[PDB]
C-alpha cells in the first residue's frame, strides 16, 4: 500500500556496479516527505522536475536504480554525461527525467581487512547504448597479438574496490539511488 522506499534505501546489501541492480517500484503511494522534509541523504538533485511538484505524475515505471559506485562518481550519473562509469558501466540518456538521492554509506559498506566485494570493469573496446541493461557475463581479453593470461599487454578487466572504512568522501561507498520516472 505505502511505498517500499525503505526496502531500497533501508536495505542491507546492494549490487556490483558493473552489473548493477534495478528494482521496479509500483502501486505504492510514494510519500517523498520522508526524504524531502530535511536533508539526511546528502545530494538531492532532480533533473527535469521539482521536488515540490513530484505528485503530478504517474508511477508507471519508477526504476529505483540501486548500486554503489564511489564518492566522486555520482557526478557521472547526470543526463548527457560521459566517463568511466557512464560510457559502459551505467549510461544515462541526455533527455533523462528523474532524481539522484546519493547518500554516504561509509559505515555500512566497509571492511578494515579490505572490502573487495564490489567490482567494475575497467577496459572496453566499444561503448554501450542507453536504456540497455548489462546482465550478460562474457569473457574478454586485450589486443596486440592474441594472448593468454596477464602477459605483456593483456589485462583482467574487472578490478575490485578496496573499500576500507577510512577513505575520503570522494572514494567512500556512496550508496546511490537513481529514480527514473518512466
Amino acid at each position: 500500500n505505502l511505498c517500499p522506499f525503505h526496502e531500497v534505501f533501508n536495505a542491507t546489501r546492494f549490487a556490483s556496479v558493473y552489473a548493477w541492480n534495478r528494482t521496479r517500484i509500483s502501486n505504492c503511494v510514494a510519500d517523498y516527505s520522508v526524504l524531502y522534509n530535511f536533508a539526511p541523504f546528502f545530494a538531492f538533485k532532480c533533473y527535469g522536475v521539482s521536488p515540490t511538484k513530484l505528485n503530478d505524475l504517474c508511477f508507471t515505471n519508477v526504476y529505483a536504480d540501486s548500486f554503489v559506485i564511489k564518492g566522486n562518481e555520482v557526478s557521472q550519473i547526470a543526463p548527457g554525461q560521459t566517463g568511466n562509469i557512464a560510457d559502459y558501466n551505467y549510461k544515462l540518456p541526455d533527455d533523462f527525467t528523474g532524481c539522484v538521492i546519493a547518500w554516504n554509506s561509509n559505515k555500512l559498506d566497509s571492511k578494515h581487512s579490505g572490502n573487495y566485494d564490489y567490482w567494475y570493469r575497467l577496459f572496453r573496446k566499444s561503448k554501450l547504448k542507453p536504456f540497455e541493461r548489462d546482465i550478460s557475463t562474457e569473457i574478454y581479453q586485450a589486443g596486440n597479438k592474441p594472448c593468454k593470461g596477464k602477459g605483456p599487454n593483456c589485462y583482467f578487466p574487472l578490478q575490485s574496490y578496496g573499500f576500507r572504512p577510512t577513505y575520503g568522501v570522494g572514494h567512500q561507498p556512496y550508496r546511490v539511488v537513481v529514480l527514473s520516472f518512466e
Epitope: E7, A11, T12, K107
Partner: antibody
Framework: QVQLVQSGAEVKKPGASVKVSCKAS????????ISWVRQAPGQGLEWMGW????????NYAQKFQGRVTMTTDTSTTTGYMELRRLRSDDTAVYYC????????????????????WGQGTLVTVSS | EIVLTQSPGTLSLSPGERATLSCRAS???????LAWYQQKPGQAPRLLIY???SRATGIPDRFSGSGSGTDFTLTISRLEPEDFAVYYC????????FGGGTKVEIKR
C-alpha cells in the same frame, strides 16, 4: 502512540496446540512484518520465526524447523503464532515485536531491528 | 549458525557510573545486521541500538552502540535508577540468533 495489544496467559497441558494473539496498531500494516520471540522463565531470549504480512512469506528457525506455524489477520492488523506438540520445557513468556529486520515486499533484509514490543504472554504447560 | 555468546552474565553498578555490554560473534557478521534491547523487570525489551550505530526513537543521549565483524558493544554513560534492566544482542547476517542476555543489577 504505538500500541501492541497482546493476548493473556494460558494454562494449557502437554499434547495440545495453542495459537497466540497479537494486535498491533499505529502504523501502516502492510509495510512491516511481525516476529516472535520466546523466553522461558529464568532464561534468555531465543528466536522463533519471522512472517511478512504483505505476501504471506514465512521464515522459521531450524530448532523449530517444523513444529510451528504463523498466521496473520489483515482486517484487524493482528499477528498470530501457533506451536504444536507442547513439551514439558515449552513453558515460556512469548513476545510479539514489530519487524524492521527483513523487508516485507522484497524479503532480502533491512538494516534495523525489532523496534516496538508487546506486553508478553506466559503460557504454562504442565501435566 | 553464528553463536553470539553474550558476556558477561550479570552487571551490578552504582547510580551514576558508566555501563558497557559486549556481544562477540564466531564468524564475521556485517555491521548492518545487529541490534540491542533493554528489558525492564516484568516488562518487554525495547530496542536501543539498531544497525549497530543508530539510536532508536525516544532513546536518550546516554545510550550508544558500535562494533563490526566479530565484536560489538553497547554503551551507557549515566546510570539512572531506571537504567537497571535486562539487555540482549541480536544478529541477522546469516539466520537470526540472540545472545545469552546480561542482567543489570544495583550495586550497594
Amino acid at each position: 502512540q504505538v500500541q501492541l495489544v497482546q493476548s493473556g496467559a494460558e494454562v494449557k497441558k502437554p499434547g495440545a496446540s495453542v495459537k497466540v494473539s497479537c494486535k498491533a496498531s499505529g502504523y501502516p500494516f502492510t509495510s512491516y512484518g511481525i516476529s516472535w520471540v520466546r523466553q522461558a522463565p529464568g532464561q534468555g531470549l531465543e528466536w522463533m520465526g519471522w512472517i511478512s504480512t504483505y505476501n504471506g512469506n514465512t521464515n522459521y528457525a531450524q530448532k523449530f524447523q517444523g513444529r510451528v506455524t504463523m498466521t496473520t489477520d489483515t482486517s484487524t492488523t493482528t499477528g498470530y503464532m501457533e506451536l504444536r506438540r507442547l513439551r514439558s520445557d515449552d513453558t515460556a513468556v512469548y513476545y510479539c515485536a514489530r519487524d524492521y529486520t527483513r523487508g516485507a515486499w522484497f524479503g532480502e533484509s533491512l538494516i534495523g531491528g525489532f523496534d516496538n514490543w508487546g506486553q508478553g504472554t506466559l503460557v504454562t504447560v504442565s501435566s | 549458525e553464528i553463536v553470539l555468546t553474550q558476556s558477561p552474565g550479570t552487571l551490578s553498578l552504582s547510580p551514576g557510573e558508566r555501563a558497557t555490554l559486549s556481544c562477540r560473534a564466531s564468524q564475521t557478521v556485517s555491521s548492518t545486521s545487529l541490534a540491542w534491547y533493554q528489558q525492564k523487570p516484568g516488562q518487554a525489551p525495547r530496542l536501543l541500538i539498531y544497525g549497530a550505530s543508530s539510536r532508536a526513537t525516544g532513546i536518550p543521549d546516554r545510550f550508544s552502540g558500535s562494533g563490526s565483524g566479530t565484536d560489538f558493544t553497547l554503551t551507557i554513560s549515566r546510570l539512572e535508577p531506571e537504567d537497571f534492566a535486562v539487555y540482549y544482542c541480536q544478529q541477522h547476517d546469516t539466520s537470526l540468533t540472540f545472545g545469552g542476555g546480561t542482567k543489570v543489577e544495583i550495586k550497594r
